[PDB]
Design a protein around this ligand. Structure first.
Ligand SMILES: [Mg+2]
Ligand SMILES: [Mg+2]
Ligand code: NI
Length: 406
């Protein structure tokens, strides 16, 4: 028997409109990209509704776990929400509060200035710290198989799948090539290189374009749009093949520990603060920690960074995107009653693509997907695979980068 004492949820924001619409995306397909109901990068109403489903589900299961009351609003900081400054993250926090505790108006805290980046969600972005250029380069290239040419060489079945969905042979980038005595290939038409600077890593060309476009197809599906990918994505094998290109870029750029440890350090500190038993104390964002429930509205990069830094690996059954809209990395502190010891469990909770496509209300009898994770570095584990509080504490202390803390 274990008793749930605390939960921290790091969530990607919900479904949002594509953040840019470029000439290159026009040039790789003869077809017209469907337009979205909100501004570039904003949360869609359906995106908010899907988040509220997770909030409602989390209320049900946390009531069943005895952590929140069945009726009424949580009292005095029992639930806290922090969100990145972006509209889509702020609105994700509002949607989660609306599902978790409807009509309770739980405050969605942000940093003071909502017009500039919050270093909690990436300390490299405000120059708190810097990447190690040489070491990051070598690390990403090794994980790519030794070169980006080697990386794309194995993924060419998936690139051909993307070309079919695009009808790439009939695109402007194809047809305006000269001459035509040569076949059309995304990877060869758009050579891909790794670019590393003190504040960012990125991939150029086909690799980054493919990661973006396959995510757009998935967002079209989750948004309920009539025919994602111009109706040329027709079974789950095709979805899994397409999104493998997106997961592969995040594996290189955001999971690689030489990037992830730095980029995740502020979130590691906040998470460890929320999970550690201590007298309640007002801290960052004016939130009092520890408390019962902390929900943090961030981004796919944050999920990937935390997984890379903590050595948490996952694939999501029925959800082709490893870092899907509204995907939740769920940290829990459990007290084992046999000796009143403290234990940390980590999970990935997510809506399957069909649960998004169908706008399926979630509940105890229709739950989201959930993957139980293990901290690979943990040396002190209980019968349920949880890491001891002290073991988890050492892992975070070893994984974090002190220069990157706030
Ligand atoms: Mg339970
Ligand atoms: Mg406040
Ligand atoms: Ni993703």
């Amino acid at each position: 028997e274990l008793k749930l004492e605390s939960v921290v949820i790091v969530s990607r924001h919900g479904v949002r409109a594509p953040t840019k619409a470029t000439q290159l995306m026009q040039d790789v397909t003869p077809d017209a990209w469907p337009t979205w109901p909100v501004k570039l990068g904003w949360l869609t109403p359906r995106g908010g509704e899907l988040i509220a489903y997770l909030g409602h589900y989390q209320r049900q299961r946390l009531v069943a776990d005895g952590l929140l009351a069945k009726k009424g609003c949580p009292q005095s900081g029992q639930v806290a929400i922090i969100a990145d400054v972006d509209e889509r993250t702020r609105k994700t926090g509002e949607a989660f509060a609306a599902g978790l505790a409807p009509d309770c108006a739980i405050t969605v805290h942000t940093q003071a200035d909502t017009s500039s980046p919050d270093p909690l969600f990436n300390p490299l972005k405000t120059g708190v710290c810097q990447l190690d250029n040489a070491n990051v380069t070598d690390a990403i290239l090794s994980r790519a198989g030794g070169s980006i040419a080697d990386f794309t060489g194995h993924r060419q079945t998936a690139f051909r799948e993307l070309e079919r969905v695009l009808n790439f042979p009939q695109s402007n980038l194809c047809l305006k090539r000269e001459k035509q005595d040569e076949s059309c290939s995304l990877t060869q038409a758009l050579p891909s290189e790794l670019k590393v600077s003190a504040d960012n890593v990125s991939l150029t060309g086909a690799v980054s374009l493919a990661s973006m476009l396959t995510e757009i197809f998935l967002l079209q599906q989750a948004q309920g749009m009539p025919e994602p990918g111009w109706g040329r994505i027709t079974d789950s094998h095709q979805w899994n093949t397409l999104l493998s290109l997106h997961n592969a870029q995040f594996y290189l750029l955001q999971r690689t520990p030489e990037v992830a440890r730095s980029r995740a350090t502020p979130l590691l500190d906040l998470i460890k603060t929320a999970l550690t038993p201590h007298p309640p104390q007002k801290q960052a964002y004016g939130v009092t920690l520890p408390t019962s429930v902390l929900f943090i509205a961030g981004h796919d990069t944050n999920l990937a960074n935390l997984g890379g830094a903590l050595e948490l690996n996952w694939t999501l059954p029925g959800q082709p995107d490893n870092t899907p809209p509204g995907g939740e990395l769920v940290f829990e502190r459990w007290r084992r009653l046999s000796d009143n010891s403290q234990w940390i469990q980590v999970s990935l909770v997510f809506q399957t693509l069909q649960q998004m496509r169908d706008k399926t209300p979630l509940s105890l009898n229709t739950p989201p997907g959930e993957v139980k994770l293990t901290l690979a570095g943990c040396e002190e584990r209980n019968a349920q695979g949880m890491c001891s509080l002290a073991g988890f504490t050492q892992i975070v202390n070893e994984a974090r980068i002190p220069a990157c803390s706030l």
